Symmetry: C3
Subunit: 188 residues, 3 copies
């Protein structure tokens, strides 16, 4: 088995189905950014400690879901031989329940917080912002091609999950969040 | 409080003031990249150790400043109800004084260095390059819309700060920098 | 020595040779993304432990090679005073030999794996995906300007190297890889 085929050496790559695209095509960029997020989630999970073990399984579950999203991003809406398989309903509800629970448990803020704290909380803020970068890429693709809009819904919700989980990670080690000193009351 | 409004689920988001933009709009991308930098700075600060404690407070101060920059990037120059609040003078002087001090104290190089060393020094090099990525985004926005040019000045200077601070972090643990083996003398 | 010249404060920067470009120009973006990768490789190397010491030297060698690639990306193909110096043959063979060896030694998969595991393996997956992001940037530049195509070949191969090395890092700590649960058999 050779994972290097060399077929990409001139700048084109195969997507799902027959088409080849330049590697900078917005479709390739979209699922490539999802893959970068997925790798960062793996890195974040590797930082789990005894205080934060309760977050481990759901990070692995998110990795599984990000593969399901990437599949659909790699699939043209008019490819007769392949169809969209990601459905947002249940995964997105699942994220919302976590967001509600973690928002309830941590100390309430009205103001923006500095993205930081523990190493794990900080990594969850990095995940938050890479998710949002991948979301931008997905919207770029959406403006040119038909996509599975359920992926967008889920990826939008996912960055709120990472915010909530980052605060929960600080709570699990009793690290206080720090406020942005010039913040207005923005959370209502 | 629900941080998930779902109003972003179709790919548009609210900026400062009345306007909504696509999430891939260059303005949204610019302050989104600043937020990614800010999160990375949080992560970097979480790596502080007893040798490097002297760097902790100024990283937190940079996080505060990055919120002030992001505010102005999110604000249209013609929005009557909101105005630019970031002024570069004092923060940028403050960075320059750190850059001068840290450049003086560490072993002099003429050649490019490998970006690495200690975990903290390496993270400061990652911060250096994410700052430069955010700067590119800010210039993309500048070419289409009027911006607070003071944010650009500060963000330019900030990546030189991260270079200087990365070298200082290696110095604080007595980790030598490594040279790029084919470098010309580039620092003059 | 002042690394801050302030000449970049209005959004333009000097490349190799006489030209100045906007900081968001695709050329500047391409070698800037290579620099971000290089910094991440430095960070990854800082995570080496006693189990993974055998990977340290080759990560440093990759950093040297990434400077050689960045040089050529910063050099216009028609700049009479500067020429391309990167040749892919030997570095790319060297990567392929590592990929072959590491593919042979680790447990065989047919299915996609979750990008994660140990902290080092996870960082090598982050390197994999940042390499692929830089590759996209390089292809963007290739579509507008003549480049040294040897850089593209090497950067393509490099992300397969990081995949193989990430799996090898997990093997070195006897951390099993996890499969994507809905994967088809994709590695043939
Ligand atoms: C989509 C895709 C991905 C996506 C998968 C998730 C996603 N959709 O976002 C991403 C970007 C994550 C990915 C990554 C990689 N992929 Co890929 N991937 C593909 C692709 C296009 C389809 C995969 C699939 O689901 N096939 C199953 C069904 C849908 O396809 P089918 O034709 O009907 O059968 C194929 C190429 C292709 N068009 O088949 C490669 C392909 C499977 N991938 C390949 C490789 C090598 C990789 C990576 C190792 C590349 C890298 N260095 O990072 C990684 C491995 C990731 C992992 N964690 O295991 C190779 C495998 C070559 C081989 N010897 O078998 C393929 C065949 C592409 C190629 N010809 O070069 N990939
Ligand atoms: C700008 C902005 C940001 C910027 C702030 C800094 C910057 N400027 O770069 C960034 C991108 C960092 C950000 C991040 C987030 N933001 Co925000 N942000 C906004 C925004 C547009 C204005 C904030 C502000 O300064 N308001 C104060 C004054 C200037 O506004 P005013 O109308 O005159 O009062 C608002 C939406 C809006 N147009 O008001 C949301 C808004 C406050 N943010 C929101 C959220 C949820 C977030 C994030 C949690 C999103 C995420 N998952 O990452 C994070 C939290 C970051 C943190 N560390 O605390 C929500 C809060 C919803 C609620 N229930 O109150 C808002 C209301 C947007 C929305 N309707 O969805 N944000
Ligand atoms: C290319 C380049 C880089 C590339 C180098 C590798 C690559 N090619 O991808 C990258 C992007 C990595 C880089 C980074 C930096 N660079 Co640079 N770089 C340059 C450049 C354009 C050429 C360097 C070179 O190889 N010269 C040697 C031969 C080819 O040039 P020559 O004219 O024939 O002699 C110069 C500007 C220029 N046009 O000379 C700056 C330049 C050397 N860099 C500069 C600086 C400050 C940096 C950084 C510190 C910026 C930062 N804050 O991140 C880092 C240092 C990186 C390190 N690890 O040491 C400054 C140094 C100023 C001084 N006082 O000497 C220069 C002079 C640009 C400027 N005028 O502002 N750089
Ligand atoms: C909190 C604020 O963050 C901005 N916002 C919403 N989604 C994204 C994204 N994917 N990338 C960057 N910024 C975003 C909007 O301005 C929203 O109101
Ligand atoms: C050191 C060199 O790095 C380049 N340079 C300057 N600013 C940036 C940036 N934001 N992103 C990437 N590269 C940049 C220019 O080529 C400068 O001369
Ligand atoms: C494994 C699959 O990953 C995609 N692919 C190939 N190169 C890149 C890149 N630089 N960025 C993102 N995705 C890429 C193609 O779809 C290939 O078949
Ligand atoms: Mg959102
Ligand atoms: Mg600069
Ligand atoms: Mg490839
Ligand atoms: Na490959
Ligand atoms: Na939200
Ligand atoms: Na400089």
């Amino acid at each position: 088995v050779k994972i290097y085929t060399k077929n990409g050496d001139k700048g084109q790559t195969r997507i799902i189905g027959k088409q080849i695209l330049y590697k900078n095509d917005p479709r390739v960029a979209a699922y490539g950014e999802v893959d970068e997020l997925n790798s960062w989630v793996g890195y974040t999970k590797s930082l789990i400690n005894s205080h934060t073990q309760v977050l481990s399984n759901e990070l692995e579950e998110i990795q599984q879901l990000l593969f399901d999203c990437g599949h659909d991003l790699a699939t043209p809406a008019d490819d007769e031989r392949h169809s969209f398989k990601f459905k947002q309903e249940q995964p997105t509800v699942w994220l919302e329940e976590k967001i509600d629970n973690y928002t309830q448990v941590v100390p309430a803020v009205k103001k923006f917080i500095l993205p930081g704290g523990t190493q794990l909380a900080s990594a969850l803020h990095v995940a938050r912002t890479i998710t949002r970068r991948a979301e931008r890429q997905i919207v770029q693709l959406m403006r040119e091609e038909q996509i599975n809009q359920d992926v967008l819904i889920f990826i939008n919700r996912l960055s709120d999950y990472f915010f909530a989980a980052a605060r929960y990670a600080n709570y699990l080690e009793q690290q206080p969040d720090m406020l942005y000193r010039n913040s207005k009351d923005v959370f209502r």
